[PDB]
Design a protein around this motif. Sequence first.
Motif, PDB file in Angstrom:
ATOM      1  N   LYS A  43      45.124  -5.502  -6.872  1.00  0.00           N
ATOM      2  CA  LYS A  43      44.251  -4.823  -7.837  1.00  0.00           C
ATOM      3  C   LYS A  43      44.942  -3.631  -8.560  1.00  0.00           C
ATOM      4  O   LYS A  43      44.827  -3.451  -9.553  1.00  0.00           O
ATOM      5  CB  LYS A  43      42.916  -4.634  -7.332  1.00  0.00           C
TER       6      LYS A  43
ATOM      7  N   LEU B 248      48.065  -8.000 -13.127  1.00  0.00           N
ATOM      8  CA  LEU B 248      48.353  -8.834 -14.264  1.00  0.00           C
ATOM      9  C   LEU B 248      48.146 -10.239 -13.621  1.00  0.00           C
ATOM     10  O   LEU B 248      47.332 -10.896 -13.888  1.00  0.00           O
ATOM     11  CB  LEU B 248      49.838  -8.781 -14.950  1.00  0.00           C
TER      12      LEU B 248
ATOM     13  N   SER C 169      44.613 -10.987 -12.365  1.00  0.00           N
ATOM     14  CA  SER C 169      43.650 -11.041 -13.297  1.00  0.00           C
ATOM     15  C   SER C 169      43.618 -12.515 -13.960  1.00  0.00           C
ATOM     16  O   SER C 169      42.944 -13.025 -14.297  1.00  0.00           O
ATOM     17  CB  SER C 169      43.667 -10.171 -14.402  1.00  0.00           C
TER      18      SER C 169
ATOM     19  N   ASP D  99      42.054 -13.985  -9.418  1.00  0.00           N
ATOM     20  CA  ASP D  99      40.621 -13.643  -9.474  1.00  0.00           C
ATOM     21  C   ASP D  99      39.791 -14.002 -10.774  1.00  0.00           C
ATOM     22  O   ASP D  99      38.755 -13.820 -10.906  1.00  0.00           O
ATOM     23  CB  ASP D  99      40.177 -12.183  -9.236  1.00  0.00           C
ATOM     24  N   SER D 100      40.529 -14.616 -11.542  1.00  0.00           N
ATOM     25  CA  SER D 100      40.129 -15.130 -12.793  1.00  0.00           C
ATOM     26  C   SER D 100      39.025 -15.814 -12.700  1.00  0.00           C
ATOM     27  O   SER D 100      38.796 -17.007 -11.952  1.00  0.00           O
ATOM     28  CB  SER D 100      41.239 -15.868 -13.595  1.00  0.00           C
ATOM     29  N   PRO D 101      37.783 -15.515 -13.224  1.00  0.00           N
ATOM     30  CA  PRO D 101      36.392 -16.322 -13.086  1.00  0.00           C
ATOM     31  C   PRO D 101      36.502 -17.488 -13.948  1.00  0.00           C
ATOM     32  O   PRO D 101      36.458 -17.570 -15.147  1.00  0.00           O
ATOM     33  CB  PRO D 101      35.396 -15.445 -13.803  1.00  0.00           C
TER      34      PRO D 101
ATOM     35  N   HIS E 269      42.250 -15.523 -22.169  1.00  0.00           N
ATOM     36  CA  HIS E 269      41.744 -14.137 -21.390  1.00  0.00           C
ATOM     37  C   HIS E 269      40.585 -13.595 -21.926  1.00  0.00           C
ATOM     38  O   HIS E 269      39.664 -13.077 -21.087  1.00  0.00           O
ATOM     39  CB  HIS E 269      42.909 -13.366 -20.615  1.00  0.00           C
ATOM     40  N   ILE E 270      40.528 -13.088 -23.046  1.00  0.00           N
ATOM     41  CA  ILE E 270      39.259 -12.324 -23.476  1.00  0.00           C
ATOM     42  C   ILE E 270      37.978 -12.928 -23.376  1.00  0.00           C
ATOM     43  O   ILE E 270      36.899 -12.267 -23.297  1.00  0.00           O
ATOM     44  CB  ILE E 270      39.540 -11.712 -24.991  1.00  0.00           C
ATOM     45  N   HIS E 271      37.935 -14.072 -23.803  1.00  0.00           N
ATOM     46  CA  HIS E 271      36.567 -15.203 -23.680  1.00  0.00           C
ATOM     47  C   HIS E 271      36.599 -16.084 -22.670  1.00  0.00           C
ATOM     48  O   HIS E 271      35.451 -16.707 -22.152  1.00  0.00           O
ATOM     49  CB  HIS E 271      36.253 -15.734 -24.937  1.00  0.00           C
ATOM     50  N   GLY E 272      37.739 -16.512 -22.017  1.00  0.00           N
ATOM     51  CA  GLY E 272      38.001 -17.471 -20.852  1.00  0.00           C
ATOM     52  C   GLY E 272      37.694 -19.017 -21.385  1.00  0.00           C
ATOM     53  O   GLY E 272      37.954 -19.068 -22.436  1.00  0.00           O
TER      54      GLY E 272
ATOM     55  N   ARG F   3      30.424 -18.809 -11.932  1.00  0.00           N
ATOM     56  CA  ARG F   3      31.901 -19.117 -11.875  1.00  0.00           C
ATOM     57  C   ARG F   3      32.586 -18.987 -10.674  1.00  0.00           C
ATOM     58  O   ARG F   3      31.884 -18.345  -9.595  1.00  0.00           O
ATOM     59  CB  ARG F   3      32.719 -17.930 -12.799  1.00  0.00           C
ATOM     60  N   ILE F   4      33.593 -19.473 -10.397  1.00  0.00           N
ATOM     61  CA  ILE F   4      34.397 -19.301  -9.070  1.00  0.00           C
ATOM     62  C   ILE F   4      35.788 -19.073  -9.536  1.00  0.00           C
ATOM     63  O   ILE F   4      36.268 -19.402 -10.664  1.00  0.00           O
ATOM     64  CB  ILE F   4      34.202 -20.845  -8.419  1.00  0.00           C
ATOM     65  N   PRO F   5      36.342 -18.309  -8.448  1.00  0.00           N
ATOM     66  CA  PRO F   5      38.041 -17.696  -8.620  1.00  0.00           C
ATOM     67  C   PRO F   5      38.801 -18.648  -8.873  1.00  0.00           C
ATOM     68  O   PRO F   5      38.802 -19.939  -8.448  1.00  0.00           O
ATOM     69  CB  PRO F   5      37.991 -17.166  -7.305  1.00  0.00           C
TER      70      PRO F   5
END
Lengths: 125, 93, 93, 246, 55, 385, 385
Positions: free
Chosen positions: G5, G12, G15, G19-21, G202-205, G218-220
């Motif tokens: 982190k 980078l 994220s 860990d990206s949800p 990445h900004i809104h997923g 959400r899950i990782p």
Amino acid sequence: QSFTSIARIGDYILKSPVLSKLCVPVANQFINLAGYKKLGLKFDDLIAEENPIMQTALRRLPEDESYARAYRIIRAHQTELTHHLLPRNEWIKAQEDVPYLLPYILEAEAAAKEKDELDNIEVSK
Amino acid sequence: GPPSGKTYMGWWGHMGGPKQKGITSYAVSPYAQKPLQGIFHNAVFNSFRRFKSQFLYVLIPAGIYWYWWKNGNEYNEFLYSKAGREELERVNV
Amino acid sequence: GPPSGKTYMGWWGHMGGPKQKGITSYAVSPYAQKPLQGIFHNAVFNSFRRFKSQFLYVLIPAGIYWYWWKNGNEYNEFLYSKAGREELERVNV
Amino acid sequence: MTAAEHGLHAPAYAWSHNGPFETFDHASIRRGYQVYREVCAACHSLDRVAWRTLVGVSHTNEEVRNMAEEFEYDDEPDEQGNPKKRPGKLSDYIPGPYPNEQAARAANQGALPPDLSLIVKARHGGCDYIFSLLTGYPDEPPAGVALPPGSNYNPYFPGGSIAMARVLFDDMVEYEDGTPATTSQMAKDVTTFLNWCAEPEHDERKRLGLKTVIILSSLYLLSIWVKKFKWAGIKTRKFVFNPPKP
Amino acid sequence: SSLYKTFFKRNAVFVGTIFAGAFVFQTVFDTAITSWYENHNKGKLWKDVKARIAA
Amino acid sequence: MAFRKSNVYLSLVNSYIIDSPQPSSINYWWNMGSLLGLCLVIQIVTGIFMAMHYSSNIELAFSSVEHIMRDVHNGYILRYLHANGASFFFMVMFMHMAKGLYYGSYRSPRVTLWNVGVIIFTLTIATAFLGYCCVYGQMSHWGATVITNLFSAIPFVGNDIVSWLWGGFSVSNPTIQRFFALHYLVPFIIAAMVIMHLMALHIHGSSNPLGITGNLDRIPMHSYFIFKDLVTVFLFMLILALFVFYSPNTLGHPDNYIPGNPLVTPASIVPEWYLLPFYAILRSIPDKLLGVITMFAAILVLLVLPFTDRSVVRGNTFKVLSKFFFFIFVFNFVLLGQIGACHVEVPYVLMGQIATFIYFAYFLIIVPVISTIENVLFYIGRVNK
Amino acid sequence: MAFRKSNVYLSLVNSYIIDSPQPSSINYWWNMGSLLGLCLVIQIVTGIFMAMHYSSNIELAFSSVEHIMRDVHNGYILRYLHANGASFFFMVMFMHMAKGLYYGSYRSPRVTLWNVGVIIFTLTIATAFLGYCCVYGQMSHWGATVITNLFSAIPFVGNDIVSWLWGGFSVSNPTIQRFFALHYLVPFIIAAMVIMHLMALHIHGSSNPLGITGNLDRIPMHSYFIFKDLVTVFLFMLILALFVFYSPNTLGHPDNYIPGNPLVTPASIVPEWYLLPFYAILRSIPDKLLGVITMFAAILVLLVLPFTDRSVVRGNTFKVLSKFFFFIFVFNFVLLGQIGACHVEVPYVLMGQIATFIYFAYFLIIVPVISTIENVLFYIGRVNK
Ligand code: HEC
Ligand code: HEC
Ligand code: HEC
Ligand code: HEC
Ligand code: HEC
Ligand SMILES: COc1c(O)c(C)c(C/C=C(\C)CC/C=C(\C)CC/C=C(/C)CC/C=C(\C)CC/C=C(\C)CCC=C(C)C)c(O)c1OC
Ligand SMILES: COc1c(O)c(C)c(C/C=C(\C)CC/C=C(\C)CC/C=C(/C)CC/C=C(\C)CC/C=C(\C)CCC=C(C)C)c(O)c1OC
Ligand SMILES: CCCCCCCC1=C(O)C(=O)c2scnc2C1=O
């Protein structure tokens, strides 16, 4: 290099009249050639601050000294960018060039060293 | 976003420096200043100063290296001329 | 760092959804579950269901296009055979 | 290293093309071409030069066309497959005296006369060197020099022993423009022509350079002024400190 | 300089006027240079050599 | 907020080029970085346009470059720009590096910044060398031969790695063609590395000539430094222009206008000026293995500086002994370069050996010793007990 | 915090990949993206290794590819991988695009995400085509001829742009050599574009199959989707393996095993399967200028979808009329492709013209009309007044 170490060596030399008369005059000449005083700075203002010891030290420094350090640093950057020096009557005098931050730096180093010692203490039964 | 690591620089409004107080700055618009021409008479003798304090730190090490180079070069020239073919057989192999 | 624009997704702890309350989830470790083999007898007749509801939306448009293609193809074949050289001169130019 | 090994340093002759604002002398290029054809071409190729590049430089379109046609090149095979020749055209490259490296050595004691297309750029000294080498053959080698059979002495060439004999002698060429064909005049000419062969862009390059340097100089000066203006507020900025009371 | 205030009047020069001037400059400058250059080398050029030739 | 702040793409540009807070006192030495980006672009652009006319075959490589020189419209401008640009790329890189050395830019918390920079330097050397081999002149062939042979020094497998790299018995058609493919690839890796360099720079920001904090007085990158960068960009272009149009071959070697010859190595070989200091170091060790190890170490030793600098202040601005020795190091480097251009002869070999010693001693002995002494001097000159 | 982190580079990666949800309900249709990155890597890697043995000269290009096929160790594996890989690259891209169409992935707030994707698609078409020309077979030469001529349709200067692009009188040695240089360059531009695509994502997923918010559950990315991606990566490799080793030329054209001939165009020309739908559209317009304009419009019309979709809900999951018409559009596209492989003959020309109409009508008429009708149906089926 730690300030505790610098002090050890520096104090040893300072006490012995053999080295004390040999070195100090050289050191004084060195400090004048450095020229930081012509920029309105005190040596302690030059210490690199990007480490925990120095951050603790600057945090414990009383208010009035802190505002003063701030003014000296800004004034220095402005003179530097103009490629001039301050008018001689504004230069820091030798009497003024006092190690004001040093006592805070040494206190923090001892505190730090103790913690390092205690976290690693062995035990003999 | 994800949590960020602590640094020694922030951004406008939280740069990371100590709390300032008592200092007051003043400035005048570049538009109201004398068109670039006054950088003489007042800013000419003052200049060149930031090199009269430094040239020694540059000149001495330069001088030392120039003489060392010139010496070895002139010696090389001699060694390979007629006069030095004798000393050349001495220092060579 | 510099200020960031508002989005419709945050991160763990501030994802951006509404405040949840009253909902309780339960789960059992994959380690304590029956090794992958029970996906039959109980999970076989249940499967294929998610295509019995969809195949029409795929089959009809497919059927329509298949017949259209087959028709035009068989017509082409005829036009270029002997029997159709007469109709070919009619529809051609 | 001994002087004999390095070779005698070529001095600096005042070439008309030396200098930022100077073009080649095209009359000299023209003459040089003749010296190359009548003397040098006997042993030296000029592989990288195309006939067409001579047009408008040292000869007319017509003159070059006549020159190229005196030579034969392999043409495309006939209706039946048998090979056939053909006269030269502007698109072709100036032909060399030898068909291969082996025949070139056979005709020169085993030495290989190099191609002169880039010779001026392929040697330290450039024009000064080529000229000096050509006009620097002494009638007799210095005392004590044991010159190998078939070799020649020239002080400008490294090691002194060169496989090329002196080939330029007074009035061995009848300059079409009337100029006295002395050995130095001819050397001065071929060298100029050889410089053009290696750097055909020369004249044009220097013209473009003059434009480029004037614009960039101006841009550089202008930027300084703009920068100072944009910085004046910060530069003359002033501070005052008034210690806050506790 | 009142010479500036007559054409642009206390405002900066706009892109359009800049681009337009650039196209004019490119032509004028190139002629001025080619001229000076050829005159400086008079007698050495092919133009000059072609005249002294007759065939 | 402003659009430049909210847009996903523009905010990156805003944070790095527009609103980035810069220390008010940085000098023209801080302008080398942008100059390095410019160089990278000039190299990539001129390279792609020439690639359109270049043939990598060993029988056509040399002539295809001549074709670019004689037939391609503005071809000579492209080649001289690319060639002279590589040199200018190194002149500017050394100044960028020297600037870092002098001001303690390599110090904490910018160690990562300094290490990525070392990697870039290595990648740049590799890139220029591969490009050099594409001309396939006399220098090209022997350089390709020497550098690839550098690997035979590895015990056991060394000669294998070499025949592998060559793709045959010697430097031949499989060699030059793979070198061209590689010369095209590496510049894009440098670009990616340059982005990581910038990311590392952004977390703590630039340092300044005083060596202290800049947090008390910063000014926006936009306007102030954009226009100051313009000053050196134009000066850089003026000088490059002078070489490209008026003296295109001064920084090259005449031997490269002669096609490569497998059977004959030139009587006098002088490598690219920016490799000379390293060539001298290699030549100074009368052992094959130790020779190549010491040369590579001349570059890797740059990694040691954050640990051997014992000082308590950043930079040489207020340090008499350090400034003096800094310049001994600089001129010693130039000397090494001069030795590299000379023949392996008497006064030179010993001079080369001593200069090599001095080079390594600066990092391992002089800096730690001097910085310690200076620390003490600073103390005893003010403490009264 | 964890090192992953705090580190500038690792965060980078953390994220975006760890860990990206992710919305707990995404299905295997969301696995195409990673598959597209994999394809990009496979294309770049196999391409660089072949570039080591390839010659761009028009007299050697064809034979150098044969040289890669016969002499280079594992050469045929490299060529068949690169060639069949390009096809697989498009099969996966269409599925990625179709997935977006069906689930309303192009809708706000992911418009930027969708537009960057359109640019990538165009760059990919350009890349594959340039690569196709490097083989210099019969199809290569005529393709290079047709596509470059596409520009002559521009009034006034058109024929000039063409002679410029060719670098001469016709498709010749200056053409193929610049095409190789360009084929190497473009893939790195796609890579940079792929990064911008990911930044926008990445900004809104990611969206999900239900078309609603994912913020409540959400899950990782790490573990769950890394391992799910592995499933399709292996399946993708298995199938590509079957073509590479067992049927390497099924997706190619026999005419490309014949060297290009300036004087003879093959009696039957069938372009690459992934270009067929566009070839049919071009052929259906009996006018030169209008023909090329309509073809280019077949791609740009994808930009219109965020505005013509009048629905109030995202995606076709709960929409009877939209699902039905979605498939009419899909099979109409396949039909266009089939028409492209046929001769310009009677039943086919009219079929081609109608299919082209249907293609454009989907975006401009059907979607806006149907979505409006569905909006109303949804309302009157529950409101009691
Ligand atoms: C054949 C009888 C020749 C004639 C006529 C000329 N040259 Fe020559 N040249 C010849 C040989 C055999 C060699 C090889 C010399 C060696 O020792 O390798 C050469 C070489 C040259 C060179 C290159 C010299 C160098 O520095 O390496 C030059 C510059 C050269 N020759 C020029 C030259 C010119 C301009 C001539 C006509 C005036 C000329 N040569 C005639 C053989 C012969
Ligand atoms: C294909 C694109 C391409 C890129 C990208 C590229 N080059 Fe080159 N480079 C070439 C080609 C083609 C040549 C051969 C032509 C020539 O000699 O200039 C060459 C030659 C060279 C040479 C030899 C110069 C000479 O004397 O002829 C050097 C040195 C060089 N490149 C350095 C670089 C550097 C440094 C970079 C990037 C930071 C770079 N190149 C990027 C294509 C490229
Ligand atoms: C130089 C690196 C290089 C890169 C990067 C590269 N290619 Fe290629 N490609 C080549 C070479 C070399 C050939 C010629 C050999 C061959 O035919 O496979 C080629 C040929 C092709 C062909 C013709 C295949 C055939 O039938 O022979 C296609 C299609 C193609 N490339 C697609 C792509 C795509 C799509 C990408 C990237 C997304 C890509 N290439 C990236 C080098 C590259
Ligand atoms: C071996 C070291 C090293 C190399 C090589 C290196 N850098 Fe740097 N760079 C640094 C350091 C350290 C800093 C921090 C300077 C400071 O703030 O004191 C820096 C700072 C920068 C800056 C900020 C402005 C400046 O000049 O201080 C830029 C931009 C930059 N580098 C670009 C580049 C590019 C582009 C390259 C080459 C392709 C490059 N650097 C190669 C060490 C390096
Ligand atoms: C014309 C459209 C388009 C093209 C082409 C495109 N994308 Fe996408 N991509 C999207 C859209 C829209 C999404 C959002 C999907 C969603 O969340 O519904 C997306 C999402 C993604 C994702 C997230 C996972 C997934 O598959 O949903 C990845 C990874 C991705 N794309 C990679 C790529 C790569 C790599 C390429 C090609 C080189 C590419 N995309 C080309 C439209 C496109
Ligand atoms: C904190 O301190 C800073 C600071 O942060 C910055 C950023 C700067 C400013 C300097 C920079 C930002 C330098 C940055 C440089 C780069 C990002 C370069 C990246 C490099 C590249 C090579 C990009 C790649 C290019 C391409 C792929 C395209 C080129 C090719 C083309 C267009 C081919 C076209 C073909 C045809 C047929 C027409 C400072 O001056 C500074 O000082 C205090
Ligand atoms: C929000 O939702 C997501 C999501 O965000 C992500 C990221 C993924 C996972 C997928 C990806 C991250 C795909 C990403 C792909 C890329 C970044 C590809 C980038 C591409 C490249 C081509 C890199 C460039 C490579 C090179 C320059 C080097 C190759 C060449 C070499 C090594 C030559 C070596 C030479 C010699 C001589 C040995 C999901 O599955 C997903 O689903 C829900
Ligand atoms: C960091 C790598 C330094 C490169 C050193 C190799 C220098 C080097 C040699 O040692 C050599 O013998 C020849 S022969 C032609 N060129 C070269 C050359 O560049």
